[PDB]
């Protein structure tokens, strides 16, 4: 309101197509996390529900990043085995 207009959350189209700039804008809001913020601020969530959701999200993030680390560690063993029928 008090700020200057049309600087924030603004992308410009290239060569006359708007759908690509729209997916660009949606990626900006997605990495900034604003999309889930608008989904979660449609209704009110109690602080107990907020704490449970943050604990669940932290647990899932820890498990997923550690599992992806294990996949990236074991990716070099996906080659064909040299000792078949030994």
């Amino acid at each position: 309101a008090n700020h200057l207009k049309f600087i924030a959350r603004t992308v410009m189209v290239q060569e006359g197509n708007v759908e690509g700039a729209y997916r660009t804008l949606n990626r900006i809001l997605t990495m900034d996390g604003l999309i889930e913020d608008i989904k979660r601020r449609r209704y009110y969530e109690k602080p107990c529900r907020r704490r449970q959701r943050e604990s669940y999200e932290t647990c899932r993030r820890i498990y997923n990043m550690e599992m992806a680390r294990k996949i990236n560690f074991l990716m070099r063993k996906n080659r064909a085995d040299p000792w078949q029928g030994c």
């Binding site: 700020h3 660009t24 809001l29």
Partner: protein
């Protein structure tokens, strides 16, 4: 760190939205991450730097953050 230098505080801020990046994007010691957060918020309240956007005069600063916006 300082609250008077807008450029250093605004490098760690998203250009389109004005959000403050976390440790996984910024990559600091926790002491400096807390000092950057407090210095930004002091500059936000005291009127030295914009809230809703990055100040466009410092738009072309070198990128220290590891977030990639264009794919």
């Amino acid at each position: 760190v300082d609250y008077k230098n807008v450029q250093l505080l605004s490098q760690f801020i998203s250009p389109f939205t004005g959000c403050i990046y976390g440790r996984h994007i910024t990559g600091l010691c926790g002491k400096k991450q807390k000092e950057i957060t407090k210095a930004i918020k002091r500059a936000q309240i005291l009127g030295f730097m914009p809230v809703t956007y990055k100040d466009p005069a410092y738009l072309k600063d070198p990128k220290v953050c590891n977030i990639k916006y264009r794919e």
